[PDB]
Amino acid sequence: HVEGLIAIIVFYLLILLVGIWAAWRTDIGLLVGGFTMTATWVGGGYINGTAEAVYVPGYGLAWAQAPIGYSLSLILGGLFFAKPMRSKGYVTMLDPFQQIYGKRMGGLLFIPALMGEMFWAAAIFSALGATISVIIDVDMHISVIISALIATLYTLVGGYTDVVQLFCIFVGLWISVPFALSHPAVADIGFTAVHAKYQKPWLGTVDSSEVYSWLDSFLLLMLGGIPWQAYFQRVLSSSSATYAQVLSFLAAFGCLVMAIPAILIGAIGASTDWNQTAYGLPDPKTTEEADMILPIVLQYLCPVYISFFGLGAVSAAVMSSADSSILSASSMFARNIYQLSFRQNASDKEIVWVMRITVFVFGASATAMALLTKTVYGLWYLSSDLVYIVIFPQLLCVLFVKGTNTYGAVAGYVSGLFLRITGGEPYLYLQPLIFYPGYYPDDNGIYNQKFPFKTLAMVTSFLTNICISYLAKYLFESGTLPPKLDVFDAVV
Ligand SMILES: *[C@@H]1O[C@H](CO)[C@@H](O[C@@H]2O[C@H](CO)[C@@H](O[C@@H]3O[C@H](CO)[C@@H](O)[C@H](O)[C@@H]3O)[C@H](O)[C@H]2NC(C)=O)[C@H](O)[C@H]1NC(C)=O
Ligand SMILES: C[N+](C)(C)CCO
Ligand SMILES: [Cl-]
Ligand code: NA
To answer: Mutating residue 318 to L: what's the consequence?
Structure first.
């Protein structure tokens, strides 16, 4: 197993060097697109969130589903969505919705995408702030504010760096594991994977009653990661469809390669006798600092220059993801809402002036949410919840179903939102209203659900869209309803 890992890391390093040379020169070129897509996809959530999920007792590796689902989402996109979206003149993911349903429905569907982008930005800001606070020894709120300011300045100024940033992430992450593994306080991770030396084994467990919840979460992560503007901008900006498919496949492979050292760092943190280090007792989890485990491992189990290399890798990943997130949000707003829904005649100066103010407002909101949070994996998971509930069924309807109307879209929107909201939300303090079978009280008194209700909400939204569209089409034609009642003008 060691030889295979060495071979794959050597192969990835060699192809990275080839990509760097090719990008400097600018046959080859499909490599640099995949590398840039990988740099866009992998950020603060892929590293700190994965380490925190592996480290926390009660989660383990079994419940760290996001790094695998988000990689499978790229494969699914390249398989089924890249070609249908490429030959219709679309510039934004919201264009088909506005062209088929209307501008108001596009504006309505804009909200979950903005919420997801905001959650992702908050998560990555929290990750970078925690790293800066631990390694440089600064107050956490100041560190988060500094990280947000640096990201905003980088995005504004930027308007083959991605390949070099990916190289920095790869080298900085992979150079730290050998030094942390050799510390005297760390035990054999192969033993502690199953045998519970200091805490529960870091390979988790799934009970016979939680299989449906596990599948529900996995489906949410895998299907909610597809409809994002950061991916579709790259898909639409390709020169051919095969180019986009190969780019998606290479990006997925790169993300899978990137995920491994974070899991190793989480296991190392879970296999440490902290009484033998300068951190001392209590443990990083007895103190409410379990989301800081990667910087703590870098600072207290590695030499100083290794910790600085890890800091540089985290900074590179966070910058490369934040730039794309902010740009996608601002572009979506400035094109689809401000210039299409109203004020259709606007000069180019007005558009850039709108873009800058949107960038600042989005950054401020993400900074506030990052300041108010206490977990990185939670926001990374939640960034795709409403996307999966709302946007995915309607994308399926517009791409592959003929006969969709504005009526079915309204019905599906309302039904999906109702079911999801009524289900409950244990991260907040919202309580369920339906109480599906298998509910149990938590430590905080909040009821959790063992029934897979989010997938049910998604399927209900899709089926309601189809059924209401065809019912309206039958009703307005063939008499029955006179034409004056066609308010949406969807059937005429
Ligand atoms: C964290 O590590 C330190 C360092 O080893 C631990 O300190 C150790 O504490 C034990 C008891 O608390 C000491 O044992 C004592 O030995 C004397 C004989 O010298 C005996 O008469 C006493 O009754 C007691 O058994 C041990 O000497 C001491 N080690 C050092 C180097 O001072 C500490 O206990 C560790 N903390 C935890 C929670 O394990
Ligand atoms: C944008 N997502 C949150 C869906 C994936 C990040 O890796
Ligand atoms: Cl991320
Ligand atoms: Na990145």
So the answer is: In CMS20; uncertain significance
